[PDB]
Ligand binder design. Structure first.
Ligand SMILES: CCCCCCCC/C=C\CCCCCCCC(=O)O[C@@H](COC(=O)CCCCCCCCCCCCCCC)COP(=O)([O-])OCC[N+](C)(C)C
Ligand SMILES: CCCCCCCC/C=C\CCCCCCCC(=O)O[C@@H](COC(=O)CCCCCCCCCCCCCCC)COP(=O)([O-])OCC[N+](C)(C)C
Ligand SMILES: CCCCCCCC/C=C\CCCCCCCC(=O)O[C@@H](COC(=O)CCCCCCCCCCCCCCC)COP(=O)([O-])OCC[N+](C)(C)C
Ligand SMILES: CCCCCCCC/C=C\CCCCCCCC(=O)O[C@@H](COC(=O)CCCCCCCCCCCCCCC)COP(=O)([O-])OCC[N+](C)(C)C
Ligand SMILES: CCCCCCCC/C=C\CCCCCCCC(=O)O[C@@H](COC(=O)CCCCCCCCCCCCCCC)COP(=O)([O-])OCC[N+](C)(C)C
Ligand SMILES: CCCCCCCC/C=C\CCCCCCCC(=O)O[C@@H](COC(=O)CCCCCCCCCCCCCCC)COP(=O)([O-])OCC[N+](C)(C)C
Ligand SMILES: CCCCCCCC/C=C\CCCCCCCC(=O)O[C@@H](COC(=O)CCCCCCCCCCCCCCC)COP(=O)([O-])OCC[N+](C)(C)C
Ligand SMILES: CCCCCCCC/C=C\CCCCCCCC(=O)O[C@@H](COC(=O)CCCCCCCCCCCCCCC)COP(=O)([O-])OCC[N+](C)(C)C
Ligand SMILES: CCCCCCCC/C=C\CCCCCCCC(=O)O[C@@H](COC(=O)CCCCCCCCCCCCCCC)COP(=O)([O-])OCC[N+](C)(C)C
Ligand code: HEM
Ligand code: HEM
Ligand code: HEM
Lengths: 266, 266, 266
């Protein structure tokens, strides 16, 4: 029962994060006649269906329900790892809720804008942390008595590099400091090359289906990212990029889980 | 016979790549009286002997001949690794040939300039991939029955970091997006420090002749890079930098080969 | 007796480096009435108590004395590792002394300014190298007959990444090339995120007091760095940042020492 709950929570979390990145994609009012076929906002240095909103609310509610059910079942017939993982997920959720409470610290326009950037980026950072933790937990509930066979030669370094790239993408999306947004965009597009090189070396070190899928995911995300940039900010291209990025988060978490858990017991 | 062919192909590939980087160095017409003693083009943000051409053509022809001979001898009395390596080298060569065919995709000036940058950078990226693959193959044909003793403590991480630095250098050389060229130049000069730190730590972890040579190669390349920049773009300084960079590519490929091949059979 | 000398040299070196970064912090004349409560110089792109000086001189003299005593006792009843470490510390000290001798190479204003940046940055780089080497030596003199148990899962990668971040901070502090200073400042603040991610993954891989302390040190340094930037350059915030950064240097050196020394004898 716990395995089904954690798998459902992984799915719901991924779908909710992708959905939020699809409504929030230059959709504060989802303007233009082409709901999903109208260019989004360009990067600063380069310068309304009630259905989507109600289904976003429903998705948030249902994923909260399952996360609560998973938390309750973690302490019932669950190991210490699952309890700790859940606790870290719900601490992140509480942090997101507190970030929602935007009690005014200072009305200073500069520090106001910065704090707005901090809140917006921290929401996505906590979402990515929740997704990674729940994916590692989902791996943990499986293979519990099994011997944790590995999947790729360098999951750890790949995990860290991928998470840094995800952080760069979040900064590009939300940190609109203009000089820093341009810098972080150019660091993002360039570090994509490091990710490609690392995936190629991983595939060379041990070629299996997982290495090939990792390289193909990198290449599909890079291609998608470029496309999004090749022509304005087409919503469909911007979406596919978001979906592939969050699935890459999930994929690297799942690939890193066996390397870390191989040193555990049972 | 195969070992001699792969060694000759390694030499020819390195010499051809260096030569191309010596003619292409601000030598579209090789202007100025000092054929090799006249400053080259500065970076965008900072703003004709028939012999060389005919010997470049001869070198390209002879290296193509050997690569073809090596490909033919790979399938004759060769292992699967050598066949795959050759196939990946000739796929890269076919990709370079297709990049030579610059059928007009779009006349859009922006997307035209970008695609020009993509073609120019991809040629060098494929050249570096070919050099690395042929160096790993040359290591493979040697020590075939021998036990693959290691040379440096961290060849893999060193290989990945060095390849990322080479990619940065290629982007600086060819990607003239001005804002991005300045960014990538400053990322190149700064990541050189990371390479120096990594080489120093490698030398500390296990000091032998290979670690010392790696550190000295980094230091000679950094010094050369600075010199090239200290005074305009003197061709001799620009050349030595190119030669040392491509030899660093070869060196890190040769150093990484034993770490990856230690997990193979025979 | 050697262990006491190396521990004293570690302390003196850390305190002298921190002190120098506290006087040199926009204190060429230590102007403004608030000796330690007056904003320092902003970054270029963003635009006198005799006691402190005499105690800085006294601290330099006493730390030189101990370093000399440690060097003398290294060759007396000391192993080869300690002799080599001392020799590398005193070579760095001789290099610092030579950098003090600023014989005029070229009066070219550009190359003069660059060379000034090179001297100022190289002084701090040599100081950090001395601190790291003396911390590794202090670890070596302890546990000499003991089995070198590890402290954190990834000390090496953490050491290299931390040293690169320290290099970035030194460049931000001293390299005032304006376009490059802005770039390196934005690379510093962004690579702090990579350091946080790496520390989090380290803590996940093996949670103990050392992993928690490493993560807390990163987080305290990041917080301090931001504060320094949140409001001008308050001297107290600027100081705490310097002190935490140099202690992070010492901490990562101490954490990396057991991983490298585990492959040694005795
Ligand atoms: C967990 C793993 C990831 C960790 C990532 C840590 C990363 C830490 C990164 C460093 C953060 C601090 C950066 C420096 C602050 C001062 C910036 C200032 O100098 O402006 C600079 C820009 O720089 C800014 O644009 C950067 C903004 C980054 C926001 C990061 C949010 C992190 C949320 C963390 C959530 C943690 C989890 C949730 C909480 C538990 C200068 O540019 P400007 O302002 O444009 O200057 C002109 C302005 N003017 C035109 C108006 C005149
Ligand atoms: C700026 C510069 C940036 C770039 C710098 C360079 C960056 C890249 C640097 C790292 C790569 C360098 C590789 C050099 C040696 C290659 C040899 C290899 O091909 O043979 C090996 C193939 O197993 C894998 O190595 C094959 C995948 C290698 C990548 C090939 C291209 C990617 C597409 C791939 C997919 C499309 C393929 C389409 C064609 C079929 C031999 O293995 P095996 O003996 O057959 O099997 C036993 C070994 N095993 C037990 C572990 C499995
Ligand atoms: C943009 C998105 C791109 C997505 C790309 C996806 C690429 C995915 C590529 C494939 C990745 C998965 C490959 C799994 C292979 C496992 C093999 C091995 O581990 O055997 C294991 C099986 O494990 C399987 O049963 C797990 C199957 C999981 C399917 C996941 C589908 C993901 C869809 C993603 C959709 C994303 C959403 C898309 C729309 C938004 C072990 O099995 P066993 O040994 O038999 O154990 C029995 C032991 N016993 C007998 C004791 C009981
Ligand atoms: C294999 C290992 C290495 C992999 C590396 C992968 C790296 C992928 C990297 C990302 C590539 C895509 C980058 C973003 C595209 C849009 C850029 C646009 O925003 O312009 C931006 C610049 O940015 C550009 O200057 C960057 C150009 C990089 C070219 C890289 C070629 C890669 C070849 C791959 C070959 C693969 C092998 C061969 C094929 C199999 C903005 O700047 P601007 O344009 O100046 O704006 C003003 C313009 N104006 C003044 C005119 C108004
Ligand atoms: C922003 C800051 C950036 C910088 C941050 C720091 C970056 C650097 C951080 C990593 C280095 C930190 C080292 C600290 C400890 C040094 C101890 C070492 O010297 O002794 C060791 C020497 O073996 C090697 O360690 C010697 C090479 C070390 C580098 C010396 C400087 C480079 C020049 C070197 C060449 C010129 C030498 C010229 C003088 C002769 C002791 O080894 P052993 O016991 O004698 O032998 C047995 C061990 N063995 C079996 C493995 C072989
Ligand atoms: C800018 C360029 C800078 C270049 C810097 C170069 C620095 C180079 C520094 C030296 C690097 C090479 C050191 C090799 C040491 C090997 C030791 C060990 O492995 O023994 C091996 C020998 O292996 C040797 O035979 C290989 C010799 C290769 C020489 C390469 C010269 C490179 C020149 C580059 C010119 C570049 C072009 C320059 C002009 C453009 C094994 O031997 P064995 O054990 O006897 O095996 C017998 C087994 N059996 C008995 C069963 C049969
Ligand atoms: C050991 C581990 C760490 C190693 C780190 C190695 C790092 C090597 C890094 C590369 C160093 C060389 C950089 C390029 C040189 C040319 C720069 C030039 O293009 O200016 C560029 C800026 O770029 C500069 O601002 C960068 C300055 C970096 C100083 C680094 C000191 C290293 C000390 C090492 C001590 C070693 C130990 C002590 C000695 C044994 C362009 O910007 P600009 O100039 O502003 O242009 C306009 C100027 N104008 C407005 C006037 C018109
Ligand atoms: C752009 C995006 C950037 C971010 C991307 C993600 C970046 C981060 C990615 C890496 C972290 C991902 C972790 C996922 C799984 C977590 C499971 C873990 O909690 O349980 C484990 C706890 O042991 C440690 O793992 C606990 C520390 C984990 C970090 C928790 C937050 C940091 C605060 C922590 C301190 C405050 C805690 C406050 C609350 C108490 C279970 O271990 P155990 O079974 O109990 O013990 C046996 C195992 N042992 C023998 C090895 C010890
Ligand atoms: C901004 C600064 C932030 C500082 C944050 C500091 C955080 C520090 C957090 C704590 C870090 C230290 C934890 C050590 C735990 C060791 C446990 C284990 O190794 O046992 C070892 C003990 O080792 C101890 O005796 C060493 C004690 C060192 C104390 C260092 C204090 C640092 C203060 C920093 C002040 C900085 C300056 C601040 C002001 C400028 C082994 O012992 P044993 O097994 O009994 O061996 C006996 C064997 N026999 C019996 C055969 C003889
Ligand atoms: C290689 C060329 C790439 C380009 C041109 C590119 C482009 C972009 C752009 C323009 C954004 C801003 C999105 C917005 O403003 O709405 C973005 C965000 C992002 N990028 Fe990239 N990208 C590239 C590579 C990558 C890679 C390789 C990854 C991951 C492995 C990645 C992950 C992300 C993520 C996670 C985001 C944030 C999505 C969100 O916040 O919902 N990108 N990218
Ligand atoms: C440390 C200071 C460095 C400086 C100042 C520097 C400078 C430069 C410059 C200006 C270019 C552009 C060449 C051109 O336009 O023709 C370049 C290219 C390049 N650099 Fe650096 N560099 C440095 C370090 C390094 C290091 C450490 C490496 C490799 C380990 C490296 C590898 C390369 C490569 C491969 C190229 C491309 C050569 C080619 O395309 O033929 N550089 N460098
Ligand atoms: C995360 C946000 C950070 C910000 C906003 C920040 C800010 C700064 C600034 C403005 C300086 C210039 C100091 C000066 O001009 O006097 C500096 C220097 C420095 N930073 Fe950071 N920093 C951050 C993170 C870090 C981290 C994570 C580390 C190390 C792990 C670090 C280490 C250093 C060091 C060593 C210096 C040089 C101190 C000296 O030269 O005495 N910083 N930082």
């Amino acid at each position: 029962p716990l395995k089904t709950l954690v798998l459902a929570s992984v799915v719901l979390t991924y779908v909710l994060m992708v959905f939020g990145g699809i409504v929030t994609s230059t959709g504060s009012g989802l303007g233009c006649p082409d709901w999903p076929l109208c260019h989004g906002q360009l990067l600063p240095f380069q310068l309304l269906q009630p259905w989507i909103e109600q289904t976003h609310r429903i998705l948030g509610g249902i994923t909260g329900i399952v996360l609560l059910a998973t938390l309750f079942y973690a302490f019932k017939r669950g190991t210490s790892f699952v309890k700790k993982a859940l606790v870290f997920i719900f601490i992140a959720l509480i942090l997101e809720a507190l970030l929602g409470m935007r009690v005014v610290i200072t009305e200073a326009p500069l520090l106001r804008e910065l704090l707005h950037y901090v809140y917006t980026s921290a929401h996505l950072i906590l979402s990515v942390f929740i997704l990674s933790t729940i994916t590692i937990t989902y791996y943990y509930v499986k293979f519990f008595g099994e011997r944790p066979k590995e999947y790729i030669p360098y999951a750890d370094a790949l995990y860290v590099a991928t998470m840094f790239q995800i952080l760069l993408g979040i900064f590009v999306r939300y940190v609109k400091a203009l000089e820093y947004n341009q810098f972080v965009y150019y660091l993002h597009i360039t570090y994509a090359g490091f990710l490609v090189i690392l995936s190629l070396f991983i595939m060379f070190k041990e070629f299996n289906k997982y290495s090939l899928i990792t390289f193909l995911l990198m290449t599909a995300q890079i291609l998608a990212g470029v496309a999004t940039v090749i022509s304005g900010f087409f919503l469909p291209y911007l979406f596919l990029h978001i979906a592939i990025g969050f699935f890459i988060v999930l994929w690297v978490s799942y690939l890193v889980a066996p390397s870390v858990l191989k040193t555990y017991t049972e």
